Amino acid sequence: AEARGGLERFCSAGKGRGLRALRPFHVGDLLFSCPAYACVLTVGERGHHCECCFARKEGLSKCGRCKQAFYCDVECQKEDWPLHKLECSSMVVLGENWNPSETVRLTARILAKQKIHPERTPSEKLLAVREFESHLDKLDNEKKDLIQSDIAALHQFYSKYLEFPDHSSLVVLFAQVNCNGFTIEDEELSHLGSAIFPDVALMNHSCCPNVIVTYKGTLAEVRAVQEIHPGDEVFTSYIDLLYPTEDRNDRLRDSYFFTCECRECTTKDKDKAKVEVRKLSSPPQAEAIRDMVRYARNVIEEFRRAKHYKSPSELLEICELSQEKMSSVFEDSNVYMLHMMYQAMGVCLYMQDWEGALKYGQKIIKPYSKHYPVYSLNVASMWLKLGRLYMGLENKAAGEKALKKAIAIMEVAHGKDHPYISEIKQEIES
Ligand SMILES: Nc1ncnc2c1ncn2[C@@H]1O[C@H](CSCC[C@H](N)C(=O)O)[C@@H](O)[C@H]1O
Ligand SMILES: [Zn+2]
Ligand SMILES: [Zn+2]
Ligand SMILES: [Zn+2]
């Protein structure tokens, strides 16, 4: 009997361990599904999604003690209790002074899971959490310093409720979480939480992936976006594919300690249109383009480093100011311009500026369709946000066509039967 039908763990030369197909997979086929080994709902989604299964529901039942955890019913409340009990009493005593980061909360859950279930779980048929790479020999002082900060926050918020292995074991575990952890996003790509999917973490990266990972609650699903032939390695993308090769590889080296050698990284075919420049009387020289690219990459890094504390109004002003400055060299289709429009659209949605959000979406969609792969979650989500804006602004004709473009991608990535597709189809009917 096969551990996972038509698939196998294997050794990928120069890429450690990986996943290979044994039988052919065609576009849209489900390779495998993997239940979360551990997961945690993001703080911002408390009250809107079930803390246990991540279901989006109205009328979730709150925990009577803390009144901070919300569930579908008592069954989801009972399932989550071994994890929620580590935080319940702490959330009552300490107010909003109880603030461990998402990584610290997820790691506390892995520690609790390892204690009760030391054997391999149904989520570890190919790769177990204990086998995860950590790359501790490669970590920079900054990443080593964040691991130590996370360990101290783990003792501070969980010492009374969890028994810890030694410090070295905690350094290994937080390093494994950084290298193998996932984030779960909804149908609009909004962040829902963090999770460990050991069998999904076995797949190596490519910027030309042959699979896409989607979520059905906290169940990860892996679907083919091209033919996967017997003997082919199964590759997913670890990062956002919008960016030029250099940006992608600096991100990959920083978080995963490797340089990608996929076809896109080798040919660099899409870089020219990704860094589109405007046709001026001049036009811009290499040095002026390099200066604006360096500037944009720094704004993106700064936006990333300050995300947690900056208000949506401060986030909007930076976007508008950066877009205005870059527009002297860059075309609107340039990825750095798209970065600011996407963030700025995000703020328009937050402040219920539906018309402002739509004007941004209208400019992002065509360049997104060109820059991303043919089957892209980013492209499907953008068509979906566009469609929802149009429907809300009474443009049923434009909304329906935009929702159908989303559905066409989602049928391949999420499967034809996904609840997201059923929800979108219901929105078309009403
Ligand atoms: N395209 C690629 N080239 C080289 N190493 C890669 C890679 N994709 C992923 N990896 C490696 O795999 C790590 C993530 S976890 C993925 C499976 C890993 N090969 C293992 O043996 O456990 C990365 O940190 C990096 O070591
Ligand atoms: Zn639930
Ligand atoms: Zn509680
Ligand atoms: Zn690549």
Author numbering: 3 to 432
Kindly provide excerpts from the paper associated with this entry.
Members of the SET and MYND domain containing (SmyD) family of proteins possess histone lysine methyltransferase capacity and have been shown to be involved in the transcriptional control of cell differentiation and cell proliferation. Interest in SmyD2 has grown significantly because of recent reports indicating that SmyD2 repress transcriptional p53 activity by lysine methylation (Lys370), exerting an oncogenic and drug resistance action through inhibition of p53-mediated cell death pathways. The N-terminal lobe (residues 3–279) is composed of four domains: the catalytic SET domain, located in the middle of this lobe, is surrounded by the zinc finger MYND, insertion SET-I, and post-SET domains. Immediately C-terminal to the post-SET domain, the polypeptide forms a large domain of about 150 residues that constitutes the C-terminal lobe (residues 280–432).
We have determined two complex structures of SmyD2 bound either to the cofactor product AdoHcy or to a potent methyltransferase inhibitor sinefungin. The two structures are remarkably similar to each other in terms of cofactor binding. Significantly, the two SmyD2 structures in complex with the cofactor analogs sinefungin and AdoHcy differ dramatically in the conformation of the CTD. Despite that the structures of SmyD2–SFG and SmyD2–AdoHcy are highly superimposable with RMSD of 0.36 Å over 400 residues, close examination reveals that the first two helices of the CTD (αH and αI) adopt different conformations. In agreement with the conformational changes, the flexible nature of the αH and αI helices is also indicated by their higher than average isotropic temperature factors of 41.9 Å2 for SmyD2–AdoHcy and 39.5 Å2 for SmyD2–SFG. There are, however, some differences caused by the CTD motion in the interaction networks between the CTD and post-SET domain, including a new hydrogen bond between the side chains of Arg299 and Glu248 and the potential salt-bridge interactions between Arg306 and Asp256 in SmyD2–AdoHcy. The overall crystal packing is effectively identical in the SmyD2–AdoHcy and SmyD2–sinefungin complexes, except at the packing interfaces that involve αH and αI. The different orientations of these two helices are stabilized by the differences in crystal packing contacts that contain spatially close but distinct sets of residues. Based on these analyses, we propose a model of SmyD2 activation by Hsp90, in which the Hsp90 MEEVD motif could compete with the β8–β9 hairpin for binding to the SmyD2 CTD, displacing the CTD from the substrate binding site and causing a conformational change in the CTD. This model is in agreement with the conformational flexibility of the CTD as revealed by the structural differences between SmyD2–AdoHcy and SmyD2–SFG.
